[PDB]
């Protein structure tokens, strides 16, 4: 999940 949200950056 972290990756799925941090893709914003
Ligand atoms: C959430 O964005 C998230 C959580 C976990 C993973 C992920 C991707 C690949 C692996 C993997 O190859 O495991 C080998 C031990 C594990 N977890 N991606 C995204
Ligand atoms: N918010 N994330 C980004 O903007 C982002 C763009 C591109 C990449 C990335 C990572 C790894 C590779 C590679 N190993 O070829 C290419 N591009 N990460 C983040
Ligand atoms: C590597 C990967 C794949 C799918 C969604 C987000 C990210 C960071
Ligand atoms: C979609 C989502 C979920 C949890 C925290 C942040 C964001 C953008
Ligand atoms: C991480 C984030 C959050 C909201 C707008 C833009 C960006 C890059």
JSON list of N, CA and C and ligand atoms in Angstrom, two decimals:
[
{"chain": "A", "resi": 1, "resn": "UNK", "atom": "N", "xyz": [0.81, -1.20, 0.00]},
{"chain": "A", "resi": 1, "resn": "UNK", "atom": "CA", "xyz": [0.00, 0.00, 0.00]},
{"chain": "A", "resi": 1, "resn": "UNK", "atom": "C", "xyz": [0.85, 1.26, 0.00]},
{"chain": "A", "resi": 2, "resn": "UNK", "atom": "N", "xyz": [1.89, 1.29, 0.83]},
{"chain": "A", "resi": 2, "resn": "UNK", "atom": "CA", "xyz": [2.78, 2.43, 0.86]},
{"chain": "A", "resi": 2, "resn": "UNK", "atom": "C", "xyz": [3.24, 2.85, -0.56]},
{"chain": "A", "resi": 3, "resn": "UNK", "atom": "N", "xyz": [3.66, 1.86, -1.33]},
{"chain": "A", "resi": 3, "resn": "UNK", "atom": "CA", "xyz": [4.11, 2.12, -2.69]},
{"chain": "A", "resi": 3, "resn": "UNK", "atom": "C", "xyz": [2.98, 2.67, -3.56]},
{"chain": "A", "resi": 4, "resn": "UNK", "atom": "N", "xyz": [1.78, 2.12, -3.37]},
{"chain": "A", "resi": 4, "resn": "UNK", "atom": "CA", "xyz": [0.64, 2.53, -4.13]},
{"chain": "A", "resi": 4, "resn": "UNK", "atom": "C", "xyz": [0.21, 3.97, -3.87]},
{"chain": "A", "resi": 5, "resn": "UNK", "atom": "N", "xyz": [0.57, 4.49, -2.70]},
{"chain": "A", "resi": 5, "resn": "UNK", "atom": "CA", "xyz": [0.32, 5.89, -2.38]},
{"chain": "A", "resi": 5, "resn": "UNK", "atom": "C", "xyz": [1.53, 6.77, -2.69]},
{"chain": "A", "resi": 6, "resn": "UNK", "atom": "N", "xyz": [2.74, 6.30, -2.35]},
{"chain": "A", "resi": 6, "resn": "UNK", "atom": "CA", "xyz": [3.93, 7.09, -2.64]},
{"chain": "A", "resi": 6, "resn": "UNK", "atom": "C", "xyz": [4.25, 7.24, -4.13]},
{"chain": "A", "resi": 7, "resn": "UNK", "atom": "N", "xyz": [3.58, 6.51, -5.00]},
{"chain": "A", "resi": 7, "resn": "UNK", "atom": "CA", "xyz": [3.75, 6.75, -6.42]},
{"chain": "A", "resi": 7, "resn": "UNK", "atom": "C", "xyz": [3.40, 8.19, -6.79]},
{"chain": "A", "resi": 8, "resn": "UNK", "atom": "N", "xyz": [2.62, 8.88, -5.94]},
{"chain": "A", "resi": 8, "resn": "UNK", "atom": "CA", "xyz": [2.35, 10.30, -6.11]},
{"chain": "A", "resi": 8, "resn": "UNK", "atom": "C", "xyz": [3.64, 11.12, -6.32]},
{"chain": "A", "resi": 9, "resn": "UNK", "atom": "N", "xyz": [4.72, 10.62, -5.71]},
{"chain": "A", "resi": 9, "resn": "UNK", "atom": "CA", "xyz": [6.03, 11.27, -5.74]},
{"chain": "A", "resi": 9, "resn": "UNK", "atom": "C", "xyz": [6.99, 10.58, -6.71]},
{"chain": "B", "resi": 1, "resn": "LIG", "atom": "C1", "xyz": [1.72, -1.31, -1.10]},
{"chain": "B", "resi": 1, "resn": "LIG", "atom": "O1", "xyz": [1.87, -0.40, -1.86]},
{"chain": "B", "resi": 1, "resn": "LIG", "atom": "C2", "xyz": [2.59, -2.55, -1.32]},
{"chain": "B", "resi": 1, "resn": "LIG", "atom": "C3", "xyz": [2.85, -3.45, -0.31]},
{"chain": "B", "resi": 1, "resn": "LIG", "atom": "C4", "xyz": [3.68, -4.54, -0.62]},
{"chain": "B", "resi": 1, "resn": "LIG", "atom": "C5", "xyz": [4.16, -4.66, -1.90]},
{"chain": "B", "resi": 1, "resn": "LIG", "atom": "C6", "xyz": [5.09, -5.79, -2.25]},
{"chain": "B", "resi": 1, "resn": "LIG", "atom": "C7", "xyz": [5.55, -5.90, -3.53]},
{"chain": "B", "resi": 1, "resn": "LIG", "atom": "C8", "xyz": [6.43, -6.92, -3.85]},
{"chain": "B", "resi": 1, "resn": "LIG", "atom": "C9", "xyz": [6.80, -7.77, -2.84]},
{"chain": "B", "resi": 1, "resn": "LIG", "atom": "C10", "xyz": [7.79, -8.95, -3.07]},
{"chain": "B", "resi": 1, "resn": "LIG", "atom": "O2", "xyz": [8.32, -9.13, -4.11]},
{"chain": "B", "resi": 1, "resn": "LIG", "atom": "O3", "xyz": [7.99, -9.75, -1.92]},
{"chain": "B", "resi": 1, "resn": "LIG", "atom": "C11", "xyz": [9.13, -10.62, -1.90]},
{"chain": "B", "resi": 1, "resn": "LIG", "atom": "C12", "xyz": [9.42, -11.01, -0.42]},
{"chain": "B", "resi": 1, "resn": "LIG", "atom": "C13", "xyz": [6.31, -7.59, -1.56]},
{"chain": "B", "resi": 1, "resn": "LIG", "atom": "N1", "xyz": [5.48, -6.60, -1.30]},
{"chain": "B", "resi": 1, "resn": "LIG", "atom": "N2", "xyz": [3.91, -3.75, -2.83]},
{"chain": "B", "resi": 1, "resn": "LIG", "atom": "C14", "xyz": [3.14, -2.71, -2.58]},
{"chain": "B", "resi": 2, "resn": "LIG", "atom": "N1", "xyz": [6.38, 9.57, -7.50]},
{"chain": "B", "resi": 2, "resn": "LIG", "atom": "N2", "xyz": [7.26, 8.69, -8.13]},
{"chain": "B", "resi": 2, "resn": "LIG", "atom": "C1", "xyz": [7.96, 9.08, -9.30]},
{"chain": "B", "resi": 2, "resn": "LIG", "atom": "O1", "xyz": [7.83, 10.15, -9.79]},
{"chain": "B", "resi": 2, "resn": "LIG", "atom": "C2", "xyz": [8.88, 8.01, -9.86]},
{"chain": "B", "resi": 2, "resn": "LIG", "atom": "C3", "xyz": [9.14, 7.99, -11.21]},
{"chain": "B", "resi": 2, "resn": "LIG", "atom": "C4", "xyz": [9.98, 7.02, -11.68]},
{"chain": "B", "resi": 2, "resn": "LIG", "atom": "C5", "xyz": [10.53, 6.12, -10.77]},
{"chain": "B", "resi": 2, "resn": "LIG", "atom": "C6", "xyz": [11.46, 5.03, -11.27]},
{"chain": "B", "resi": 2, "resn": "LIG", "atom": "C7", "xyz": [11.99, 4.12, -10.36]},
{"chain": "B", "resi": 2, "resn": "LIG", "atom": "C8", "xyz": [12.82, 3.13, -10.83]},
{"chain": "B", "resi": 2, "resn": "LIG", "atom": "C9", "xyz": [13.07, 3.10, -12.20]},
{"chain": "B", "resi": 2, "resn": "LIG", "atom": "C10", "xyz": [13.95, 2.02, -12.82]},
{"chain": "B", "resi": 2, "resn": "LIG", "atom": "N3", "xyz": [14.60, 1.15, -11.92]},
{"chain": "B", "resi": 2, "resn": "LIG", "atom": "O2", "xyz": [14.06, 1.83, -14.00]},
{"chain": "B", "resi": 2, "resn": "LIG", "atom": "C11", "xyz": [12.51, 4.03, -13.03]},
{"chain": "B", "resi": 2, "resn": "LIG", "atom": "N4", "xyz": [11.73, 4.96, -12.56]},
{"chain": "B", "resi": 2, "resn": "LIG", "atom": "N5", "xyz": [10.25, 6.17, -9.48]},
{"chain": "B", "resi": 2, "resn": "LIG", "atom": "C12", "xyz": [9.44, 7.09, -9.01]},
{"chain": "B", "resi": 3, "resn": "LIG", "atom": "C1", "xyz": [5.96, -0.24, -8.47]},
{"chain": "B", "resi": 3, "resn": "LIG", "atom": "C2", "xyz": [4.52, 0.19, -8.40]},
{"chain": "B", "resi": 3, "resn": "LIG", "atom": "C3", "xyz": [3.55, -0.56, -9.07]},
{"chain": "B", "resi": 3, "resn": "LIG", "atom": "C4", "xyz": [2.21, -0.21, -9.05]},
{"chain": "B", "resi": 3, "resn": "LIG", "atom": "C5", "xyz": [1.81, 0.92, -8.35]},
{"chain": "B", "resi": 3, "resn": "LIG", "atom": "C6", "xyz": [2.76, 1.68, -7.68]},
{"chain": "B", "resi": 3, "resn": "LIG", "atom": "C7", "xyz": [4.10, 1.34, -7.69]},
{"chain": "B", "resi": 3, "resn": "LIG", "atom": "C8", "xyz": [5.08, 2.20, -6.95]},
{"chain": "B", "resi": 4, "resn": "LIG", "atom": "C1", "xyz": [-5.84, 7.31, -1.45]},
{"chain": "B", "resi": 4, "resn": "LIG", "atom": "C2", "xyz": [-5.21, 7.51, -0.11]},
{"chain": "B", "resi": 4, "resn": "LIG", "atom": "C3", "xyz": [-5.43, 6.62, 0.95]},
{"chain": "B", "resi": 4, "resn": "LIG", "atom": "C4", "xyz": [-4.84, 6.80, 2.21]},
{"chain": "B", "resi": 4, "resn": "LIG", "atom": "C5", "xyz": [-4.01, 7.89, 2.42]},
{"chain": "B", "resi": 4, "resn": "LIG", "atom": "C6", "xyz": [-3.78, 8.78, 1.37]},
{"chain": "B", "resi": 4, "resn": "LIG", "atom": "C7", "xyz": [-4.37, 8.62, 0.11]},
{"chain": "B", "resi": 4, "resn": "LIG", "atom": "C8", "xyz": [-4.11, 9.58, -1.02]},
{"chain": "B", "resi": 5, "resn": "LIG", "atom": "C1", "xyz": [2.47, 13.92, -2.54]},
{"chain": "B", "resi": 5, "resn": "LIG", "atom": "C2", "xyz": [1.53, 14.90, -3.13]},
{"chain": "B", "resi": 5, "resn": "LIG", "atom": "C3", "xyz": [0.33, 15.21, -2.50]},
{"chain": "B", "resi": 5, "resn": "LIG", "atom": "C4", "xyz": [-0.57, 16.12, -3.04]},
{"chain": "B", "resi": 5, "resn": "LIG", "atom": "C5", "xyz": [-0.26, 16.76, -4.23]},
{"chain": "B", "resi": 5, "resn": "LIG", "atom": "C6", "xyz": [0.94, 16.46, -4.85]},
{"chain": "B", "resi": 5, "resn": "LIG", "atom": "C7", "xyz": [1.85, 15.55, -4.33]},
{"chain": "B", "resi": 5, "resn": "LIG", "atom": "C8", "xyz": [3.13, 15.27, -5.04]}
]
